[PDB]
Design a protein around this ligand. Structure first.
Ligand SMILES: Nc1ncnc2c1ncn2[C@@H]1O[C@H](COP(=O)(O)OP(=O)(O)OP(=O)(O)O)[C@@H](O)[C@H]1O
Ligand SMILES: Nc1ncnc2c1ncn2[C@@H]1O[C@H](COP(=O)(O)OP(=O)(O)O)[C@@H](O)[C@H]1O
Lengths: 851, 270
């Protein structure tokens, strides 16, 4: 044993597995450590300790040298003199060590730890000179610093860095503006000269400061134009949406006060009626970004009209004061010369200041009284330097309400849509970032946390709220004296009993609220109003009542969902069908038949048809192409099969994540195969189909695995398909359709990684860190058997299609299989005829029902 | 008295128990449940010999599960207080001190009575409400701050009683309510209490006149304390002070008798 241990200790060697020069690596650590583990005894103990330290050396040098050979050894502005000399000294020393000393390797550990601490603290200099940097990881921020002269790597990371900016426009390497989510540009008051020797902090600070002063100046001149009597239609196309919104709100509040000091409302009501009618007329002919702009303005002006109409029917002055005080009002400060807080908002006699952060042009939540009460309780909690809270049933409009409040008060709330995937480090980092910036950090599904992370994050948020209440600048957090701007706050949302309430310490410093029932009537009414339909109220009441009776009188299936998200999807899907079917009841009937009909059974379908005929009143080229494609394929068009193919086609036309459910032999594979063939014949695009079974492939094969020892990544089959379709060397995927199918069950563990795909992000989440986009041409399709072990979250974010019965009769199966066998193969004619007359259905159905 | 909570609170608790193990003292760790993980590590490492060392715990029955071995190397006691509406009014009145004229302290007085009435109605689970709510003094603090902020803006005589009533019933005292009947009864009690009429009748016994236009705050506080001391608590307080039917409290007492007798008859089987 001793001889073997001595031979193993004296047999120290390495292997050549690294890339380029690199570092010679060593493997098989367990055997060496076991071999390593009274003067000779203490010498052997010291040798075992040295072997463990060599293992630590190898692990840390792999983890450091991967990033070093990536960025550190080929880039200098991340280490921009002391860091220069430290990096070159450690580089030459460890290169000599790898080319060829226990105290030498201990000093190597010390030097690598010092270099790691130096680079991390350099990152904290980045995150204190500009704390929006603190959203990013270490490697991503290193890449940001390294791309100091390219000036174009910040465009793709711009969404992650701020939260509402997608790209930056450029002009001879001088900044002119930035782009929003829907193509809206945010021009600056003045351009900034990008000097050759600059670092990211200074020009990013002047960038967001000029964003603040730019929206300030645009709001000021829009207010001046509105005070000059300028009409809204000409100013919609001129300035940015944020300034237009703030000017409209300020003008509405001031004018309604100047008309509320007396008792009259008809003049401003008629004026805003003419304004919204003209705004809709301008909407009916504008482009897409202008359509979104006028959409948001018409939402807000519908809110103004609703408030004015409610105020008109007040019986007494005190009723008018009650109803006006509960509505969110906007005020202005014409006395303070500072350009940061000239505008503030007031709700129920409170005071909160605006932030001058760009929100982009998001969809605006329809202003319902429940949303106003939620805004009132949040501003009541925020007046006392407390935190708001929300708990109730799932899908009742909590996170969207928080985002709406952030958009009104003018800050991008960083939504922490948390699940089991998130760890402590990202939550702590984003919480301290929200603390330092002064941007609100909302939590989504706080009950979903594990026990120890929930307790620890509860401790962190308790400490940050305690620091907010006493108003101290410095609060101990994450083992550092992190400064706290007095404008930060924390939010939370809950779904209890599905886990627990808030803990007692958080219950002491929070205000609970419940918003269990969203008012779907007014949301549907105003979404029909903005959609341009002739009868918004009647159609909205009809669709809500129909959905309620459908939910009441259907089967209690787990895959059913008839809440508010489905109705919003219906109304967001109506408009492309509206563009060719016109505006009326017929197009919304067709949309209901297109998105809600395919998810039902058979009794549910007859109930659906009966109710649709009760409350509501009630393409040949694609059908003919599908029939020809199936006839070429050898199938037969039964009415049920052709119908289900039609809903599948009309369903894939809009959505891009379709699942299919049915028993064995139902005919789902044939359905999507013949629809793909019809698509290839009709649209002219080439069609390629990829078949994957998600259960026989493990996760380490479906996506891949990081090597814990070899430090190498292997691309899984799904990931390899994604890379080879994203690169597009042949160029086929530009003019061809890609169709990957999942012909297996639905394992939750195999779809938690798919959750990024099934969301609207169209991105792949990996343990590596690299992200590749999902093209709109990419179509994920599923082929399952039952929905017993699938979460109700995934059935809503993606479409579902149900196969109630067999798509085709028996004789269709005989004919198809006869044709297939003949394809596999004057005698043929008579043999086929005698086979056919031997296949007499009159006795065949009898023998089948007797078998 | 020494509450737990943040890391500073934990260090203060450790220093205080070290001081009482050095020289003695009587320590009450109020609301120790809120720091459950720190309790599970620290108290276990502590207990599982100076003279005159006494310290107490403060947990909740409807809270997180305490460690079983910790409960077996101590002495567990429980305490239920009297539901004295008068007593809790006196306690909340003495807890506070009072600032904007005498309308502010009159509103704080009315708010203390409303909070006491709601807390008294809280205990009766099947009739007063629909579930076991948990009100406390933080809600009273928010309500008082809201009232002061309303009275600071419009100091005129026409006090917007409807606005503060709706804000109390919906946003302040209606935050923890999920269903409709509890919100309805809280709104009804807000209408009864915060009416601000010529003479308010919270209970058939005592009446609270509104302050006039010349009262100073010291003698107004004296007058309100005097009208506080003159009140009497009748034997039917649990049904007459909260506007509940006699049949309702009879139903509550017969359900109490039914559950205790069913428990005893289940005890006698084994
Ligand atoms: N019109 C038709 N005429 C004849 N046979 C048909 C027709 N349509 C579908 N089929 C039959 O459907 C079969 C495939 O059905 P299905 O989609 O259920 O297959 P699958 O992928 O094996 O399904 P599952 O995995 O759910 O068992 C084909 O083998 C074919 O014989
Ligand atoms: N004006 C509105 N009021 C209430 N809900 C809305 C409004 N507009 C949209 N919604 C819907 O509310 C949903 C938000 O649900 P959310 O509170 O996030 O559920 P969960 O918290 O369970 O994720 C969105 O999916 C959206 O469809």
């Amino acid at each position: 044993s001793l001889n073997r241990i001595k031979k193993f200790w004296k047999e120290a060697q390495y292997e050549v597995i690294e890339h380029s020069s690199g570092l010679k690596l060593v493997r098989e650590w367990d055997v060496l450590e076991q071999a390593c583990k009274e003067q000779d005894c203490l010498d052997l103990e010291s040798k075992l300790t040295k072997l463990s330290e060599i293992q630590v050396n190898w692990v840390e040098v792999q983890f450091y040298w991967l990033d070093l050979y990536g960025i550190l050894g080929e880039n200098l502005d991340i280490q921009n003199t002391s860091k220069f000399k430290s990096l070159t000294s450690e580089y030459k020393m460890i290169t000599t060590r790898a080319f060829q000393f226990d105290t030498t390797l201990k000093l190597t550990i010390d030097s690598l730890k010092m270099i790691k601490s130096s680079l991390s603290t350099f990152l904290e200099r980045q995150r204190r000179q500009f704390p929006r940097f603190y959203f990013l990881g270490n490697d991503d921020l290193l890449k940001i610093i390294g791309s100091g002269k390219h000036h174009d790597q910040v465009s793709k990371f711009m969404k992650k860095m701020f939260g509402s900016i997608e790209s930056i426009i450029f002009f001879e390497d001088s900044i002119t503006g930035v782009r929003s989510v829907e193509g809206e540009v945010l021009n600056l008051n003045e351009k900034i000269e990008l000097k050759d020797s600059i670092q990211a902090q200074e020009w990013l600070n002047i960038l967001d400061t000029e964003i603040k002063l730019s929206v300030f100046t645009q709001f000021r001149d829009c207010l001046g134009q509105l005070k000059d009597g300028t009409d809204i239609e000409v100013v919609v196309s001129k300035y940015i949406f944020q300034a237009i919104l703030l000017s409209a709100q300020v003008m509405w509040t001031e004018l309604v006060e100047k008309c509320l000091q007396t008792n009259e409302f008809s003049k401003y009501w008629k004026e805003v009626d003419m304004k919204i009618k003209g705004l809709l007329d301008k909407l009916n002919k504008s482009s897409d970004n202008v359509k979104k702009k006028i959409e948001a303005l018409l939402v807000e002006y519908l809110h103004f009209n609703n408030v004015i109409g409610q105020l008109k029917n007040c019986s007494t002055k005190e009723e008018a004061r009650l109803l006006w005080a509960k509505v969110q009002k906007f005020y202005q400060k014409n006395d303070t010369l500072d350009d940061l807080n000239s505008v503030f908002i007031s709700q129920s006699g409170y005071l909160l200041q605006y932030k001058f952060e760009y929100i982009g042009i998001p969809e605006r939540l329809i202003y319902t009284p429940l949303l106003l009460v939620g805004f009132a309780t949040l501003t009541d909690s925020l007046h006392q330097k407390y935190g708001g809270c929300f708990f109730g049933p799932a899908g009742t409009g909590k996170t969207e309400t928080v985002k709406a409040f952030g958009q009104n008060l003018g800050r991008v709330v960083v939504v922490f849509n948390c699940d089991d995937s998130f760890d402590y480090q990202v939550l702590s980092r984003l919480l301290v970032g929200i603390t330092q910036i002064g941007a609100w950090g909302c939590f989504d599904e706080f009950n979903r946390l594990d026990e120890k992370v929930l307790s620890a994050v509860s401790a962190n948020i308790q400490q940050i709220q305690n620091g907010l209440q006493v108003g101290k600048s410095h609060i101990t957090l994450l083992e550092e004296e992190t400064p706290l701007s007095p404008h930060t706050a924390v939010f939370i949302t809950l779904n209890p009993g599905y886990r627990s309430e808030l803990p007692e310490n958080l219950k002491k410093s929070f205000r609970e609220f419940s918003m269990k029932s969203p008012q779907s009537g007014t949301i549907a009414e105003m979404i029909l109003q903005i959609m341009g339909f002739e009868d918004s109220k009647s159609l909205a009441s009809k669709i809500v009542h129909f959905l309620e009776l459908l939910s009441s009188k259907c089967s209690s299936m787990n895959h059913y969902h008839f809440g508010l998200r489905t109705l919003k999807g219906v109304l967001r899907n109506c408009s492309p069908l509206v563009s060719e079917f016109g505006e009326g009841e017929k197009t919304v009937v067709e949309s209901l038949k297109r998105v809600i009909l395919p998810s039902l059974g058979d009794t549910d379908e007859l109930v659906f048809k009966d109710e649709l005929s009760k409350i509501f009143d009630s393409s040949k080229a694609i059908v003919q192409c599908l029939k020809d494609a199936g006839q070429r394929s050898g199938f037969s068009m039964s009415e049920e099969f052709l119908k289900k193919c039609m809903q599948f086609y009309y369903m894939q036309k809009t959505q891009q994540a379709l699942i299919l459910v049915g028993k064995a032999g139902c005919g789902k594979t044939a359905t999507w195969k013949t629809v793909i063939d019809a698509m290839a014949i009709f649209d002219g695009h080439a069609n390629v189909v990829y078949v994957i079974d998600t259960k026989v492939l493990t996760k380490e094969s479906l996506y891949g695995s990081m090597l814990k020892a070899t430090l190498e990544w292997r691309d899984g089959l799904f990931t390899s398909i994604l890379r080879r379709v994203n690169d597009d060397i042949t160029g086929t995927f530009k003019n061809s359709r890609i169709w990957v199918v999942f012909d297996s069950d639905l394992d939750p563990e195999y779809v938690e990684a798919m959750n990024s795909v099934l969301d609207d992000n169209k991105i792949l989440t990996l343990p590596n860190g690299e992200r590749l986009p999902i093209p709109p041409n990419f179509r994920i399709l599923f082929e399952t058997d039952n929905l017993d072990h699938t979460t109700p979250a995934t059935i809503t974010r993606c479409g579902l299609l149900w196969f109630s019965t067999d798509v085709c009769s028996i004789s269709s199966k005989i004919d198809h299989l006869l044709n297939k066998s003949y394809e596999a193969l004057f005698e043929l004619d008579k043999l086929k005829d005698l086979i056919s007359d031997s296949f007499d259905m009159a006795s065949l159905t009898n023998i089948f029902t007797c078998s | 008295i020494i509450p737990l909570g943040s890391i500073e609170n934990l260090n203060y608790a450790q220093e205080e128990i070290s001081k009482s193990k050095i020289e003695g003292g009587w320590i009450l760790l109020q609301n120790i449940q809120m720091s459950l993980s720190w309790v599970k590590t620290y108290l276990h490492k502590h207990v599982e010999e100076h003279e005159k060392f006494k310290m107490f715990m403060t947990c909740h029955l409807t809270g997180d599960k305490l460690p079983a071995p910790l409960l077996q190397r101590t002495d567990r006691v429980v305490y239920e207080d009297i539901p004295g509406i008068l007593d809790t009014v006196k306690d909340l009145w003495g807890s506070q001190f009072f600032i904007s004229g005498v309308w502010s302290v009159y509103c704080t007085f009315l708010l203390s009575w409303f909070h006491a009435l709601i807390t008294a109605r809280t205990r009766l689970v099947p009739h007063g409400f629909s579930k076991k709510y948990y009100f406390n003094d933080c809600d009273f603090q928010f309500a008082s701050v809201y009232l002061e902020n309303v009275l600071a803006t419009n100091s005129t005589n026409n006090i917007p009683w409807a606005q503060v009533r709706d804000h109390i019933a919906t946003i302040v005292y209606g935050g923890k309510i999920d269903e409709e009947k509890d919100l309805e009864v809280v709104a009804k009690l807000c209408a009864h209490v915060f009416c601000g009429s010529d003479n308010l009748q919270i209970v058939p016994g005592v009446r609270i006149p509104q302050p006039l236009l010349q009262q100073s705050e010291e003698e107004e506080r004296a007058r309100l304390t005097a009208i506080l001391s003159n009140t009497i608590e009748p034997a039917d307080s649990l049904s007459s002070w909260l506007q509940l039917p006699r049949e309702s409290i009879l139903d509550y007492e017969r359900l109490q008798a039914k559950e205790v007798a069913s428990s005893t008859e289940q005890l006698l089987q084994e």
